[PDB]
Structures are given as structure tokens and as C-alpha cells.
Amino acid sequence: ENRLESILSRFDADWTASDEARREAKNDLFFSRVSQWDDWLSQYTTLQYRGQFDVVRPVVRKLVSEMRQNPIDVLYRPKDGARPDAADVLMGMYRTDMRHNTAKIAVNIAVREQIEAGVGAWRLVTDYEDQSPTSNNQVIRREPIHSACSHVIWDSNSKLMDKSDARHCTVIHSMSQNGWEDFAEKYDLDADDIPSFQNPNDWVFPWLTQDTIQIAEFYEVVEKKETAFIYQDPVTGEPVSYFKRDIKDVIDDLADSGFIKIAERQIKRRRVYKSIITCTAVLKDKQLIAGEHIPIVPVFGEWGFVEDKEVYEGVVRLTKDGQRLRNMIMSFNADIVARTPKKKPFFWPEQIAGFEHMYDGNDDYPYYLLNRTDENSGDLPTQPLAYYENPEVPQANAYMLEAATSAVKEVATLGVETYVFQDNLATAMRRDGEIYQSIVNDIYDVPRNVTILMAEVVDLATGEKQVLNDIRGRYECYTDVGPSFQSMKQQNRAEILELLGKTPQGTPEYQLLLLQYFTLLDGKGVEMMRDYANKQLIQMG
């Protein structure tokens, strides 16, 4: 019955379910980022040569560069029967608050972890800004998640790759003392009571200091029917506004402003609740956050289910056996070269007794002299001289080195190309666009376009706080994937150039060229050309 007991039951179930895949993913990350010689603190370990001769890392670098050369971003497009520019405002807002370094870095981190381990992820969060807000004195930013395989535990009963059917999800935060102080400061928690949770790491490297403080954030999605209030817009038409979004703030300010309630329907939607939990108590209970979706976007490589168990893989898991075999064989051969006697003659001491200074290595003599006689045996026994055999690498070692390297080269071929990995990234970006659209509808000031101009209908409460008023006719655009851009002007330039490259030299060619000069950026010479192009378009009507 306890909230903590229910939360911990769910977390324990998911943590136990996702155990094998997480362990393999952590091993792949360690293998491809720290050292291919695993098993630190093996009790039975002496000092022996352990060299790291790498063949998987150039492949991983090649794949990561290939994925980086072809960026993918969200592209909102108008729905069927919607107004032809139903997506311009949302696209502008997305480009505005997703142009920073943080969004790009989060996507890059997730992609690199997808290539190596098999799963990455990132997060979307909403912050308050007063200097450069996207809208409504707020911003939506994207944040990275490092080692998502162990730091994001998804609801077990989710059979979808993007995890859009997951009812809850827990994200584990590990912090040092100062990190915990800042965390408690930012969430208004008690910094004196040190928190604790499941440790998602492993003392697998001799890192001299490891982290000690753990918290968890538990997100849950509740889908229910809630009351909506149908009004009549003082300008024209009838809007629909959620009762919970203006439950106390402006319920009478609407009436004062001139909104008359027409009816009241029950509409089913989802709400997202966050809780800050340690292993002993719940610190924040059900803090409601903006949006309908869990704000975590996962990216996968090779993904599937085997027997009610989710498995994912990157590009490194299959090559590990061959790489480890090659490292071991090269270490054995290095030991052969180091600790093996060299090729030298075998002498009896009496054979060279007295001429011991001829074989030390100097070149002062034209030959070598040997003793011939012994007093008690008449003459020294005659036997051909022997030399210690030269060190040699065994045929087994040579064959195994060649075959292990060949196996690694044969199995470390993602795809034929990264088409499937780019498609999984595109799926993740589409889910990201869905989440961003929901959060925008929740917190941002979305203008409605009239065909009679954008009409932003909002009002302020008695506490000077402004409550946004978004109608229910909000999902006017769907999500596609297109080239990554920084601004709507850049996107328009790309579209005009694409049209230009395909239009033959006629009158639309002139139109498109003048349009490009119109949309071009500003200096002095380009300013002159843009003024001329505007004049020409206007004078051509």
C-alpha cells in the first residue's frame, strides 16, 4: 500500500528483468572505452605482459564518423486537411530551443553509446529563463544521459522500441558530495540527510575514488478522463480548455475577461508525475510535470525480444572473443621474444679454458682457438658444435593470430553502412518530436492563426502569474524526419535551393533565384542584392 513499497516493487521487477542486457552493455562500454583486458582484482594475478593491440576501435571510429556526417532532426509537417502552415510556429520554437550545444551533444552521446553498447538515451527538461526565453518565460532543453543502459531503467512490460507504451521509468543519479549539495539545493531537499539507492556502477577499474551518493527519479504516466470546460471565444468560435490547467488561477478571470461557459465534457489524457526517491523514503511525491510522455528518449542498435526478455546489441559485442584471443596471442608472442635464451654456442669449460677472451664479443682476433688435449683422457672428444636454437613463434600462435584477426574483421561489419542505426535514430527523433509537441502544448504560448493573423489569447491571474490558454485543436501537425537546421531562415534557404536545382531555366527559375536573394543573410553587398531582389519581386507582382 505504501507509495514507497509500490515504487520499489516496480523498480525491483524492472531491475531484475533487465539484468543480463545491462551487464553485457556495461561490459561492451568498458571494452570499447577503457581497456580490453577485463577482470580487475582477480586474486590469482601475477605480473605478465598484457598488451592491447586493437582492431575494433578503428571500426567504431569509422561508424561514429559516418553517423556524424548525416545528422537527423525533427520536421513538423501539417496534417491532412489542416491549414497549409500549421507547423511553422512549432517548427520555429523547436529550432529556437534545440539549436544550442547541449542538444547536439546529447544526441551525439546517445548515438555513440548506441554504436558501442547498444542503447543510448537523452532527456527533455523545462527550465525558467528571463533573458532569452523561447516563450512564456520558459525554455525546453535537451540533456544527455551517460550510460543509459545502467542509469535508465524502463518499465518491463513495454514491447515497443521507443518505449512509448511504458507506464513508468526510473533514472538513477550518482553524485559526489558537491554534486549532492547542488542537487539538494536545486530540488529543495535536505542536504544533511545523505541519500542512497541502488548503485548502477561497478568497481571494475582501479579508479582511486568512486561515487557514493545515489538518488532516483521515478516518472509515471497516468491516463484518465478529466473535466474540460467549453467556452465561447469573445472574438469568434468556441475553445476547449482543461479544467485542471485553470482550476483555481483564472476560473473567474475568464468570466471577467468575457468568456462564457457553453458546456463541459470529459476528455481523456495522460499526465506525467515525477518522484524523488531514495532506497528508504520518498522525498518528492507526485510532482506533476509538463507533457503527456515520459521525457526520456531511448536510442537502440540491434533490438528485439528473445523469450519475454529484451536484448540489444551494438557493434562491439560479437568482436570481443576474437579481440581477446588476439590480445592474448600477441602477449604470448611478446613473452616469447622477451624471455627466451638467444643463439649461442655450447662449450665445455675445458674446450675454451685459457681462450675465454676470444668469444666475449671483441673483434681483435682473426680466428678462434680451442684446447685440443687433456692429460687424463689423451685427447678431447670430437663432437660437432651445438648452438642454442633461435626463438620461434609457433605455427599454432601464428595461425590463431591470423584467424582471430580475420574473424574480428568479418564480424565487425555493421550492416553491409549505418542505414538501420540511422533509422533507429530517426525513430528516436520522431518520439522526441512527439514529446516536444506535448510539452509545448502544455507550457508554451501557442498562437492560433486566423484567416479573417496570429491571435494569442491569454490572461493574468490575481497573483500576476500568466496562465496560457491553449485550445484542444492543437495537434495540427505530425512528425517527420529531415535535415538538421539551426533556424527557419536556413531551412527556407535549403528548400529554395532544392527547388532551384530541379527547376529548368524559365520564369520560375528567375522567381526562385530572386527569392533566394531575398532570404539571404545580411552584410553590405548581399544587402544591396537583397534590396534589388525585393524590388524586382514587388514590381513583378
Add this chain to the structure above:
Amino acid sequence: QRAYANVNTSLADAMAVNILNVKDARTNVFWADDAIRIVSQPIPANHELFAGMK
């Protein structure tokens, strides 16, 4: 070797040893912060004990 000296004279036959704790007393302890170290390690993964233990 003399560079490391920390007393004036060496122990010279029948020198009296003065005991400095003569009654029961709880000890106050001062130090320089680097004088004490706490060397820690994990239990080795493949130890003889912890054999089939996850």
C-alpha cells in the same frame, strides 16, 4: 644517513625508560591530515569464496 636524524643521542646502555601514561585517561588525538590513510579495495570478482554468489 645522518640527514634523517630525529634525536640528539642514541640509546646508551642503562638509560631509564619513563612511562608517560600513568593513569587511565581517554585520549584526545591530533594529527596532520595526511598522517592516516584508509586503503580500500573491492572483493576480487573470482575469489574462491563468493563462488556462486552474484
